[PDB]
Design an enzyme around this catalytic site. Structure first.
Site, PDB file in Angstrom:
ATOM      1  N   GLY D  11     -66.636 -70.920  -3.466  1.00 27.83           N
ATOM      2  CA  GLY D  11     -67.525 -69.963  -4.072  1.00 27.83           C
ATOM      3  C   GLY D  11     -67.211 -68.570  -3.582  1.00 27.83           C
ATOM      4  O   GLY D  11     -66.852 -68.372  -2.419  1.00 27.83           O
ATOM      5  N   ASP D 110     -63.763 -74.750   3.996  1.00 27.38           N
ATOM      6  CA  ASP D 110     -63.088 -75.842   4.689  1.00 27.38           C
ATOM      7  C   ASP D 110     -62.185 -76.637   3.750  1.00 27.38           C
ATOM      8  O   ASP D 110     -61.064 -77.004   4.121  1.00 27.38           O
ATOM      9  CB  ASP D 110     -64.129 -76.742   5.364  1.00 27.38           C
ATOM     10  N   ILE D 137     -70.506 -67.451   2.938  1.00 26.28           N
ATOM     11  CA  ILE D 137     -71.695 -66.615   3.074  1.00 26.28           C
ATOM     12  C   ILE D 137     -72.797 -67.293   3.868  1.00 26.28           C
ATOM     13  O   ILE D 137     -73.836 -66.670   4.118  1.00 26.28           O
ATOM     14  CB  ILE D 137     -72.248 -66.193   1.701  1.00 26.28           C
ATOM     15  N   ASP D 138     -72.621 -68.565   4.229  1.00 29.17           N
ATOM     16  CA  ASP D 138     -73.631 -69.314   4.961  1.00 29.17           C
ATOM     17  C   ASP D 138     -73.541 -69.132   6.470  1.00 29.17           C
ATOM     18  O   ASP D 138     -74.409 -69.647   7.184  1.00 29.17           O
ATOM     19  CB  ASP D 138     -73.529 -70.807   4.623  1.00 29.17           C
ATOM     20  N   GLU D 243     -82.554 -73.934   1.382  1.00 34.50           N
ATOM     21  CA  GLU D 243     -82.285 -75.051   0.484  1.00 34.50           C
ATOM     22  C   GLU D 243     -81.822 -76.294   1.239  1.00 34.50           C
ATOM     23  O   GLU D 243     -81.904 -77.401   0.696  1.00 34.50           O
ATOM     24  CB  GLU D 243     -81.249 -74.633  -0.561  1.00 34.50           C
ATOM     25  N   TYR D 299     -77.161 -66.876  -6.758  1.00 34.75           N
ATOM     26  CA  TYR D 299     -75.868 -66.403  -7.225  1.00 34.75           C
ATOM     27  C   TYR D 299     -75.755 -64.888  -7.325  1.00 34.75           C
ATOM     28  O   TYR D 299     -74.631 -64.375  -7.380  1.00 34.75           O
ATOM     29  CB  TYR D 299     -75.585 -67.050  -8.576  1.00 34.75           C
ATOM     30  N   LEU D 301     -76.169 -62.842  -5.071  1.00 39.89           N
ATOM     31  CA  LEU D 301     -75.636 -62.311  -3.820  1.00 39.89           C
ATOM     32  C   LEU D 301     -74.122 -62.449  -3.696  1.00 39.89           C
ATOM     33  O   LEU D 301     -73.489 -61.660  -2.993  1.00 39.89           O
ATOM     34  CB  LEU D 301     -76.275 -63.037  -2.632  1.00 39.89           C
TER      35      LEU D 301
HETATM   36  O1  FBP Z   1     -70.323 -72.749  -6.952  1.00 39.99           O
HETATM   37  P1  FBP Z   1     -71.426 -73.780  -6.950  1.00 39.99           P
HETATM   38  O2  FBP Z   1     -70.820 -75.140  -7.178  1.00 39.99           O
HETATM   39  O3  FBP Z   1     -72.389 -73.473  -8.079  1.00 39.99           O
HETATM   40  O4  FBP Z   1     -72.240 -73.824  -5.506  1.00 39.99           O
HETATM   41  C1  FBP Z   1     -72.761 -72.672  -4.851  1.00 39.99           C
HETATM   42  C2  FBP Z   1     -72.582 -72.878  -3.370  1.00 39.99           C
HETATM   43  O5  FBP Z   1     -71.403 -71.900  -2.849  1.00 39.99           O
HETATM   44  C3  FBP Z   1     -71.911 -71.086  -1.966  1.00 39.99           C
HETATM   45  O6  FBP Z   1     -72.317 -69.858  -2.535  1.00 39.99           O
HETATM   46  C4  FBP Z   1     -70.894 -70.826  -0.828  1.00 39.99           C
HETATM   47  O7  FBP Z   1     -69.631 -71.423  -1.157  1.00 39.99           O
HETATM   48  P2  FBP Z   1     -68.626 -71.770   0.110  1.00 39.99           P
HETATM   49  O8  FBP Z   1     -69.239 -72.890   0.919  1.00 39.99           O
HETATM   50  O9  FBP Z   1     -67.253 -72.174  -0.393  1.00 39.99           O
HETATM   51  O10 FBP Z   1     -68.504 -70.539   0.981  1.00 39.99           O
HETATM   52  C5  FBP Z   1     -73.210 -71.806  -1.422  1.00 39.99           C
HETATM   53  O11 FBP Z   1     -74.138 -70.915  -1.005  1.00 39.99           O
HETATM   54  C6  FBP Z   1     -73.672 -72.573  -2.649  1.00 39.99           C
HETATM   55  O12 FBP Z   1     -74.339 -73.817  -2.174  1.00 39.99           O
END
Ligand code: FBP
Ligand code: AMP
Ligand code: AMP
Ligand code: AMP
Ligand code: AMP
Ligand code: FBP
Ligand code: FBP
Ligand code: FBP
Lengths: 418, 423, 423, 417
Positions: D11, D110, D137-138, D243, D299, D301
């Site tokens: 993401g 990862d 971002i976590d 969450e 999303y 952010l």
């Molecule tokens: O892209 P998706 O499948 O809709 O999931 C969003 C997830 O990606 C994130 O924005 C972060 O992605 P990463 O773990 O790859 O850094 C999380 O906050 C969120 O749970």
């Protein structure tokens, strides 16, 4: 000294504090005493003068000298509505007489203004300032309600972030724009942000919207984008679509269940989740094509944003105009600005004869502005459905024959204005 | 072959230039047109070398413009290169436009840009090329119907409000007066817009001065009267916004004091260089002499170029979209030598002659209407001494006391200001 | 009767002052303490008149502070009034604090504010009053651990990045060079922070100059070399950030040229008035003489007071909340004459005397570490002539041609700059 | 000249472009040719060099000279993952050799890093060198405590601004907002937003002592806060919910979460934590005059423009990735420690139990967590022992002190104090 009492009603909009400061500062220069009722009509409706006194504050220079920078309202707001009962109407007059309010300024939307007149029909002068982020008060066409510019600009900024995210990580966002009265806010955010589609109740020809038609309108846009190499986008939906839906449409909207109802039997449209429901259906139909769909609401985070400069100047001029109306003996009027001049407009001129309530201004879908905004959307027009090459490309993008595509989607030209 | 639309920007940037470029380009691409953009306005079209122009022209494609409506500035850059002075340059521009087979020519700029476009078109057949220009100014000085803005102005005013808000908080947190100098000498729309929105305690624009020439002493005394009146109410801080246009109304004697009691700087041609003037700095120095003993601190601050390329606010994004669309519609309807303007919610072409002021030969300058209700409302929420204030002996006693002078001295020095600025 | 916590602000404002005030007040209220705030720092406590102090103190209640953590500035204002110079003033502050029965005394400020607080405490029984100070500065020049910034620095840097972003767009859209002057004369932390984040094409800070005194000519030539090298790659625009601290390292001869070949201004007591210096403006004037003929335009711009009262970013909101809590924690744990600092994610008190530099008697000043990896990386993404670049004859020929001079002339004029600034 | 190829996975996070520009600009000064694969591994998995070429772009100075201002990623991103199949791994190997990629930089989480090392383990160490830059971002990477992952600072500050508007709206129009902060890995993002904005309550999975959360416990924790503020005359507020609470819930709790229905299965994304809590709380507290409305902060952010801290962070990371290649490093992650960007071998960061990079969660024993808890509204162990306080709170809920203690007092054994 004469007493000016100020209250806010309805949902908050950016610039409420601008009106309070504009009216109060000028009123203080005239020597007036200014007070503010907390939470709108909620305590004035009780008829208990003791309770009302516990929920009014003295509006002083130090309180208001710098609140024009601030979103929200320092005297809070409520949707308490005295017009429903004559008992409540007399209670509001009883408390106003008790506090010896000579001038009564209400800051609110259409519901707030209609409440004010009922108190006014029977000494004391009643004036209202137009407030709404939905832009649905009957102001002159080239004039907006205060808070709309701030709400639209912040909505554009949020949608921009979703636009970057949808392209960076291919996805479609279904944004659900708050407000069921009209589509001014939904269309405003969409046009400014370059969103790929906007649906408002004002563009549907028939009186009742069907759930399938709404699904297919979003589906046609997604497929046409897919035929041009784009498997992502943003679609903005006015929440007001739900209030035009037929009984059958609402049944499907709430999960093929009976729509929730209040004690009186009216449907509870707040529990509806338009964008989430559409996302689920569309993922079933288009997920195999590599399409992802996520809903997103852009609502309450707009209501109390700090005002933009346009709303700061607007509400300062409106607050002044409210005091000027009081000085010139006006009553039962709305402060409106047209051609750079703030003027009072009698309540009766704004009533819809059929309803008896303040007329609601919607998006004029016949206007040039709506047509230009529609140009920069991705959608299938009548001419597009008649283009055999285009229908072939889009149908192939949806993995269906041209005959299947025309059968399912071509009828939408009679569903929405073209 | 598809018709070729060529787009250039001239003059100083304003927020939303990219909006016009994307609005015109996207609609034109849907019509099947080929769209190209000249980098830096007329700069390279003036050379006449088609080799050089091509090296500084780009294909404006869907991918290039599909998302530039979010961005301030202009992706095709801009310049003040001006071919209208020479037909050698105008014919060079004509030679390159013909070489690239430009059927439609859209220029986004001020008058210098618009006048150049028409002059290049006058020596061309109307069948071969059609020319449209979109008028741009961040100063809000176009002659639109009153209280209707030029694109880019809303964004500049809102960002100016945000900067002044930070200065308003800083002046109160650490008592001080800021003299904000708003860039732009054409008019006072921008200074007054920022001031009213931010609740600034004073705004001075050239439009409110009755006489044809402003005196340096009067400007100092108008700010001095505001500082004293605020000081008499327990406030030894504030913010005053000064339109830079005050400098362009100053007399010869006033400019002598403005530049440090020196001869005003001059260019090779002899014309005065008002850009070198520091209005806020000079007023700050003089006011410190008069009010320093009272505990007053004064600091200047300019709000200029940081506004020009800010990302457009939603009002300007919608505005420039309709302008870009309207220009293509004008081409489709056969208009040429026309200006795309928005009036009464309608984007329409307007012939040059309707907007020209015969006295100048350039577009008429819309200034602030100081008789309008809007200006009176803005003046109400300022701190200042009115005609009625000077007649109030109790008020004059307090303000004079704040300035450590007798009431008679104060009325003698300041009461004449009621004949200097409209009341 | 509940113990009384008294709070004041000293020095210049920084984003998050209200954050510290709210952190200390809210926690103190939960303990049952009475909290008051002195307006304008030490200004009125120095008078010794308890009536005047009470007229300028306010009761810090839950409603007052419950949401000021969002707001820039300080609700109790600030001042630079300094009782430490005189025991007459120090005893006056003690007299007013005893009269108001202050048990806990929190000062939020810079070095002078902390030093005044300790001096007020040395002549005060450790059982009657306990004194704690919270370090504040937007210049990041306090001696916190290298892995820790001062509160307010993050907000000032991010807003400074945004302003320069608009100037970067404007400089490229309308080719120009901006000489941005970053406020702050102590160090270059803020200038380098803004420049690196914004991709500014050059940053000059006092810390990178090897010699003890900087020469005005060296500064001009460092910017001149950058402008030419950019010009050698087809770019006649850019942004250069200058720490205002360059002025405070300049020699006597350099300052004479800086003030216009005039005698440098002086205050009544003999301190040169460096605030009146306009470094960016003077450098622009000289550079326009040398480079105007090449098509280069240069404009100065100050980034100062608009940062000081910006609303805090989340990093400073959390930082100042933890500091306000940490000051209350120090009071409860019997600490006094200590400064609340955060190190390795832990807020702890640190005695003031432990932070003093024994050679000087004042708190040591942390400057930019120009030997660090961070500074080298920042220097990489600047446009400049390195040691090896001056030896590359192909590059030197291209740059000299851009400058309308021979390669030998270029080496003569600019090559010595490798001995002016660390590489 | 040597070829550096860059791709993004996972993401998006603010500052992705910062890393791309830092690596690309420095590499161009070294004379390298830089290319970028669109959408991560999506097209490299096919193995068709013709298809890959149609989805790779030349990363030039003009392309990257000013993307450090911009959110998102100019080469897009995807979760395409070649490590699952040895068939896909060859395909990536075949296309990289065809393009003569000498240096390979992957920016992702990862899963993205594991794919890069997998492609490198079965490739000659001389032809290709592989480095990955960890992105999230976590804030859940195992950096030294109080040291952030890039993009976290931007996401937290914008989230603070959104919550601020909800804080004004909740007070202006009395209401409670249940904000659901996106991210199931940890509670760093929820707690960061909550502390900065002064939100009245924050719940993260890390603060629950037992291994499985019960739906009833979550409702009662929020209920107690609403009542305690109500006892002080405030019928409004904002509560932030990580969450990740859902992924710690028991099977029974998830059954109640989905409306007393069977949970969907292949699915925690379909869960609506804030909405479900809002419905239950309205049943119990609506009679008291309380309205509750959920709000997700997700999303919007991910692709915000970077704040200055993240712009510097990602520029230093991009530089460090190029520095690692020059020094012969491979199968390493560019991380910043003590203000120093240095490579760290992937295996050095792995927790043996899982085989993936260890996850840093919120340390609820830290001083920082206690300070954040201080400025929340809640009932502590001491509060339940204060008879005056319990009487006022219970009265606000129109229930006896004994009934209040019976229902809520056990929560001090549910969450750390
Ligand atoms: O892209 P998706 O499948 O809709 O999931 C969003 C997830 O990606 C994130 O924005 C972060 O992605 P990463 O773990 O790859 O850094 C999380 O906050 C969120 O749970
Ligand atoms: N519905 C639409 N809205 C906006 N642009 C479109 C739409 N359909 C096609 N385009 C664009 O119009 C241009 C010409 O398309 P075409 O007519 O298919 O060659 C291309 O840039 C398309 O992406
Ligand atoms: N010049 C001014 N502009 C705006 N407000 C003012 C001005 N002068 C006084 N006031 C305010 O007007 C009110 C009445 O002032 P006074 O005439 O002293 O009773 C007070 O709130 C003053 O602060
Ligand atoms: N001083 C500098 N700072 C940053 N980039 C540079 C600098 N000098 C050259 N470059 C860039 O480095 C790349 C290779 O430079 P060269 O090999 O000198 O052409 C090109 O993209 C140049 O624009
Ligand atoms: N749970 C809580 N969180 C934050 N502040 C609180 C809490 N409970 C009480 N307070 C505040 O603590 C102060 C003292 O409370 P009391 O002991 O009730 O007088 C007041 O400002 C209260 O609003
Ligand atoms: O305050 P509520 O009851 O949650 O309803 C929110 C509604 O208020 C609005 O924000 C605007 O309210 P007003 O019509 O009173 O201006 C609408 O957009 C929305 O439908
Ligand atoms: O570009 P220059 O030559 O420095 O001139 C600055 C001028 O540009 C402006 O900022 C805006 O110019 P425009 O009216 O062409 O948009 C003026 O305020 C100012 O006079
Ligand atoms: O208040 P003044 O006298 O205008 O000084 C401004 C100075 O204050 C600052 O903003 C910060 O001052 P402090 O170090 O005391 O916080 C400096 O950057 C600047 O030099």
């Amino acid at each position: 000294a004469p007493v000016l009492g100020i209250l806010c009603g309805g949902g908050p909009a950016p610039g409420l504090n601008g009106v309070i400061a504009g009216a109060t500062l000028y009123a203080l220069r005239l020597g007036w005493k200014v007070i503010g009722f907390m939470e709108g009509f909620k305590y004035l409706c009780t008829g208990d003068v003791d309770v009302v006194k516990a929920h009014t504050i003295d509006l002083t220079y130090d309180i208001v000298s710098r609140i024009h920078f601030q979103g929200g309202t320092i005297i809070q707001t409520s949707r308490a509505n005295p017009r429903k009962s004559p008992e409540l109407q007399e209670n509001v007059r009883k408390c106003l007489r008790a506090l010896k309010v000579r001038y009564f300024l209400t800051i609110g939307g259409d519901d707030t203004a209609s409440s004010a007149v009922s108190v006014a029909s029977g000494e004391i002068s009643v004036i209202s300032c137009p407030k709404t982020i939905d832009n649905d008060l009957p102001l002159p066409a080239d004039q907006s309600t205060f808070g709309f510019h701030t709400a639209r600009s912040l909505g554009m900024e949020i949608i921009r972030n979703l636009m970057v995210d949808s392209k960076s990580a291919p996805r479609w966002f279904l944004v659900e724009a708050m407000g069921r009265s009209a589509g001014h806010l939904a269309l405003g955010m969409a046009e400014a942000s370059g969103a790929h589609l906007c649906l408002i109740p004002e563009e549907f020809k028939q009186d009742e919207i069907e759930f399938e038609d709404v699904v297919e309108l979003v589906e046609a846009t997604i497929l046409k984008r897919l035929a041009y190499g784009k498997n992502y986008g943003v679609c903005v939906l006015a929440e007001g679509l739900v209030s035009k839906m037929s009984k059958k449409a609402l049944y499907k909207l709430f999960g093929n269940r009976e729509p929730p109802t209040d004690p009186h039997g009216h449907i509870l449209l707040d529990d509806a989740e338009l964008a989430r429901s559409l996302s689920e259906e569309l993922l079933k139909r288009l997920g195999n094509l590599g399409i992802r769909i996520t809903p997103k609401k852009i609502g309450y985070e707009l209501r109390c944003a700090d005002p933009v400069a346009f709303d700061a100047v607007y509400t300062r001029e409106l607050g002044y105009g409210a005091i000027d109306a009081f000085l010139n003996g006006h009553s039962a009027a709305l402060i409106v600005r047209e051609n750079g001049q703030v003027k009072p407009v009698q309540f009766k001129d704004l009533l819809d004869p059929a309803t008896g309530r303040v007329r609601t201004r919607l998006v004029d879908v016949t206007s040039q502005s709506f047509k230009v905004a529609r140009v920069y959307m991705w959608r299938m027009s009548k001419k597009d459905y008649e283009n055999k090459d285009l229908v072939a490309r889009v149908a192939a993008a949806g993995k269906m024959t041209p005959e299947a595509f025309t059968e399912k989607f071509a009828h939408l030209t009679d569903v929405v204005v073209e």
